[PDB]
């Protein structure tokens, strides 16, 4: 989302802690999207669901 | 996608969910292997005796103002719809409670005929083989002519099945098939009992047969869930672009717009009906087991009819 | 516009004139009648003899033919479950006769132009319209 | 919220979604059973477990957005080739099949196929009460009848 | 016996007469179990 009423878009929540260096792996039910896969590498995905 | 190919080739994002499934034969419909004796015995079949035995007091009371053997012999004959030659009890005052019992009888069987007629037109056929861990898919020892598994011996399912169950494919080596439609022709002529192949092709071919008889074990239970994909030159720069674009289709719903060519069909278990001629009504042996057991007990009580010899 | 197809045969269950399951409408139950008559005969002999099948057939077919009950109780406890078995088989025959006549037939036919029998072509289906027409 | 807002044709649907959203998974699951919320949208791998344990709710069939949960890593960490292999190995030698058997599909109540062909012959009171009243009233009617027999 | 009733009825004389009633009973049990079936078929498929 576009935060701080300016031209800056930061990533809320869990994925921001991956981007900011608070962690190095996310092991959770985290889906595969087009918006997250712009700069976050994923793996072969555990399961198949909808 | 597997491990033996991912070392040499790079792969894209998984593309269609798939795996190793098993197509079972198109067997005849089956009702339950027993009559619907499920829990009437919990409450009704036990309340019957304790509400049945209580009329002995009034059967004594009508002779005071015929009980040892004749009373229950009357009271069983009309509850189970039989004109056994049975003497009625004496007096018009005894005639009331049997006329209540008859009203208990007509309500009873018309109930019991109803639920059974309700039960045998809503029960579903059950999938006589389930999972690869069954004894049928193990070493087929004790089976008149035993199970014959079909597979195509060049591909991914062979390389997955040779590293988990060696003796399975060691037995399956005599039963190779030369094509997908030839596997169906071998399944229709009794030449094959079950077939093992990819999940997506089998889920397509379940929907495009001219009949819509039995198709797949379970509903969609697959053993080794993987995907399809797009192979590519090793560490080429064009991976990370294509890796986005396929996901863009998932973002737009265009795969369901691409559904009109892809896997839809006719009779994909869209009725879950079963109609069966009951040549398999020979599962009634349980009530035959309720027959001959009494044929045991009639001898057993005979032994205790040697007890006046000591008395 | 709409599509025209050909109706099937489907039969009724008239040809099952008291033979819906005559493969398994066994004579084994008649052998059971005879051997349970023999069993009641032996129970009455060694604790009304030749008439026992006229008892036992009269248990099955709801026909009150004029005989006497067995004197020993050991035959009576068998006769109870024999009548119980007779009720079970006649009720099961009633419900399975209803099962043939309540259930309809498969081969659901094609539904509009969004059917893969018609959208994706094959050789097994032939489609036609009048030439040079609005179709 | 990303999938609905990306699509434009479902946009009006998205405009109905902004005034009722929740903050956690368990909140909406508890709020459905309190009849404040008639329907809910989430993943199949949570809803198929929830309809097998809290045994009052049901799913309704089809799927929309087919994907899978993946391990999220930072970009170009050197583990991107290692952890992508063993996961596939775990799909091969039957580890994940043991895992969801231990954790996911381990319990049920009954699959709601809507089969009314079953019992619940639990109670029998109104049908046994006619003979339970007959056994009580019969002795009083027998006493009245023998009182008639003694007089005339 | 064709309409399922235990009317107090004397059977005919002799064991040779006992056969045809035992056929008629087999005509009876087939009949009502038929007639209960079709009626149970009829009243759950008819439209308002």
UniProtKB/Swiss-Prot annotation, chain D:
Domain of life per record: Eukaryota
Extracellular membrane side: 1-123
Transmembrane segments: 124-144
Subcellular localization: Cell membrane; Postsynaptic cell membrane; Synaptic cell membrane; Postsynaptic density membrane
Disulfide bonds: 55-109
Residues linked to a glycan: 82
Coiled coil: none
Residue positions binding glycine: 43
Tissues expressed in: Detected throughout the brain, in brain cortex, cerebellum, thalamus and olfactory bulb.
Subunit structure: Heterotetramer; the NMDAR subunits are modular and harbor tiered domains that function in concert to regulate opening and closing of the cation-selective ion channel pore. Forms heterotetrameric channels composed of two GluN1/zeta subunits (GRIN1), and two identical GluN2/epsilon subunits (GRIN2A, GRIN2B, GRIN2C or GRIN2D) or GluN3 subunits (GRIN3A or GRIN3B) (in vitro). Can also form heterotetrameric channels that contain at least two GluN1 subunits and at least two different GluN2 subunits (or a combination of one GluN2 and one GluN3 subunits) (in vitro).
Function statement: Component of N-methyl-D-aspartate (NMDA) receptors (NMDARs) that function as heterotetrameric, ligand-gated cation channels with high calcium permeability and voltage-dependent block by Mg(2+). NMDARs participate in synaptic plasticity for learning and memory formation by contributing to the long-term potentiation (LTP). Channel activation requires binding of the neurotransmitter L-glutamate to the GluN2 subunit, glycine or D-serine binding to the GluN1 subunit, plus membrane depolarization to eliminate channel inhibition by Mg(2+).
Protein name (Swiss-Prot/TrEMBL): Glutamate receptor ionotropic, NMDA 1
Organism whose genome encodes this protein: Rattus norvegicus (Rat)
Span covered, complete protein: 690 to 838 of 938
Curated annotation (Swiss-Prot), chain E:
Intramembrane stretches (start-end): 1-12
Taxonomy, superkingdom: Eukaryota
Region ranges (Pore-forming): 1-12
Tissues/organs with expression: Expressed in the hippocampus including the dentate gyrus (at protein level). Detected in adult olfactory bulb, brain cortex, hippocampus, striatum, thalamus, superior colliculus, with much lower levels in inferior colliculus, midbrain and cerebellum.
Modification note: Phosphorylated on tyrosine residues.
Transmembrane annotation, as ranges: 20-35
Protein's cellular compartments: Cell membrane; Postsynaptic cell membrane; Late endosome; Lysosome
Site (Functional determinant of NMDA receptors) residue list: 4
Cytoplasmic-side segments: 13-19
Entry note about domains: The extracellular N-terminal domain (ATD/NTD) endows NMDARs with a unique capacity for allosteric modulation, harboring several binding sites for small molecule ligands that act as subunit-specific allosteric modulators of ion channel activity. A hydrophobic region that gives rise to the prediction of a transmembrane span does not cross the membrane, but is part of a discontinuously helical region that dips into the membrane and is probably part of the pore and of the selectivity filter.
Subunit details: Heterotetramer. Forms heterotetrameric channels composed of two GluN1/zeta subunits (GRIN1), and two identical GluN2/epsilon subunits (GRIN2A, GRIN2B, GRIN2C or GRIN2D) or GluN3 subunits (GRIN3A or GRIN3B) (in vitro). Can also form heterotetrameric channels that contain at least two GluN1 subunits and at least two different GluN2 subunits (or a combination of one GluN2 and one GluN3 subunits) (in vitro). In vivo, the subunit composition may depend on the expression levels of the different subunits. Found in a complex with GRIN1, GRIN3A and PPP2CB. Found in a complex with GRIN1 and GRIN3B.
Role: Component of N-methyl-D-aspartate (NMDA) receptors (NMDARs) that function as heterotetrameric, ligand-gated cation channels with high calcium permeability and voltage-dependent block by Mg(2+). Participates in synaptic plasticity for learning and memory formation by contributing to the long-term depression (LTD) of hippocampus membrane currents. Channel activation requires binding of the neurotransmitter L-glutamate to the GluN2 subunit, glycine or D-serine binding to the GluN1 subunit, plus membrane depolarization to eliminate channel inhibition by Mg(2+).
Protein name per Swiss-Prot or TrEMBL: Glutamate receptor ionotropic, NMDA 2B
Gene label: Grin2b
Coverage span on the entire protein: 612 to 659 of 1482
């Amino acid at each position: 989302e576009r935060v701080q009423n300016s031209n800056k878009k930061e990533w809320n929540g869990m994925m921001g802690e991956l981007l900011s260096g608070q962690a190095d792996m996310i092991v959770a039910p985290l889906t595969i999207n087009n918006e997250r896969a712009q700069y976050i590498e994923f793996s072969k995905p555990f399961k198949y669901q909808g | 996608i597997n491990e033996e190919r991912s070392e040499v080739v790079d792969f894209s994002v998984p593309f269609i969910e798939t795996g190793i499934s098993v197509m079972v034969s198109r067997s005849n419909g089956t009702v339950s292997p027993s009559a619907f004796l499920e829990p009437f015995s919990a409450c009704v079949w036990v309340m019957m005796f304790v509400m049945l035995l209580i009329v002995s007091a009034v059967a004594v009371f009508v002779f005071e103002y015929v009980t040892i053997g004749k009373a229950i012999w009357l009271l069983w004959g009309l509850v189970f719809n039989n004109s056994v030659p049975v003497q009625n009890p004496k007096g018009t005052t005894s005639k009331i409670m049997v006329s209540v019992w008859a009203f208990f009888a007509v309500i009873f069987l018309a109930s019991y005929t109803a639920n059974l007629a309700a039960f045998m037109i809503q029960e579903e056929y059950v999938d006589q083989v389930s999972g690869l861990s069954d004894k049928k898919f193990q070493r087929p020892n004790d089976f008149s002519p035993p199970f014959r598994f079909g597979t195509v011996p060049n591909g991914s399912t062979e390389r997955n099945i040779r590293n988990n169950y060696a003796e399975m494919h060691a037995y399956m080596g005599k039963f190779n098939q030369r094509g997908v439609d030839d596997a169906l022709l071998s399944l229709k002529t009794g030449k094959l009992d079950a077939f093992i192949y990819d999940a997506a092709v089998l889920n397509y071919m379940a929907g495009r047969d001219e009949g819509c008889k039995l198709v797949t074990i379970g509903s969609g239970k697959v053993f080794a869930s993987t995907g399809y994909g797009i192979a590519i030159q090793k560490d080429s720069g064009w991976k990370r672009q294509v890796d986005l674009a396929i996901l863009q289709l998932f973002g737009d719903g265009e795969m369901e717009e691409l559904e009109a060519l892809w896997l839809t069909g006719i009779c994909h278990n869209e009725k879950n009906e079963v109609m069966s001629s009951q040549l398999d009504i020979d599962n009634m042996a349980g009530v035959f087991y309720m027959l001959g057991a009494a044929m045991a007990l009639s001898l057993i009580t005979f032994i205790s009819e040697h007890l006046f010899y000591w008395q | 516009l709409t599509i025209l197809v050909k109706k099937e045969i489907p039969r009724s269950t008239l040809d099952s004139f008291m033979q819906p399951f005559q493969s398994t409408l066994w004579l084994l139950v008649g052998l059971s009648v005879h051997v349970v008559a023999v069993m009641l005969y032996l129970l009455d002999r060694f604790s009304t003899l030749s008439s026992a099948m006229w008892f036992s057939w009269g248990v099955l077919l709801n026909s009150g033919i004029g005989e006497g009950a067995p004197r020993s109780f050991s035959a009576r406890i068998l006769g109870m479950v024999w009548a119980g078995f007779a009720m079970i088989i006649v009720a099961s025959y009633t419900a399975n006769l209803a099962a043939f006549l309540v259930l309809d037939r498969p081969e659901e036919r094609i539904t509009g132009i969004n059917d893969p029998r018609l959208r994706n072509p094959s050789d097994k289906f032939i489609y036609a319209t009048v030439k040079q027409s609005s179709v | 919220d990303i999938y609905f807002r990306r699509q434009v044709e479902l946009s009006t649907m998205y405009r109905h979604m902004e005034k009722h959203n929740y903050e956690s998974a368990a909140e909406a699951i508890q709020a459905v059973r309190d009849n404040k919320l008639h329907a809910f949208i989430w993943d199949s791998a949570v809803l198929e477990f929830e309809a097998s344990q809290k045994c009052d709710l049901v799913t309704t069939g089809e799927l929309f957005f087919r994907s899978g949960f993946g391990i999220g890593m930072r970009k170009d960490s050197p583990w991107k080739q290692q952890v992508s292999l063993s996961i596939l190995k775990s799909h091969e030698n039957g580890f994940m099949e043991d895992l969801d058997k231990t954790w996911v599909r381990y319990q049920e109540c009954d699959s709601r196929s809507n089969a009314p062909a079953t019992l619940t012959c639990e109670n029998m009171a109104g049908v046994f009460m006619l003979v339970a009243g007959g056994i009580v009233a019969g002795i009083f009617l027998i006493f009245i009848e023998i009182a008639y027999k003694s007089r005339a």
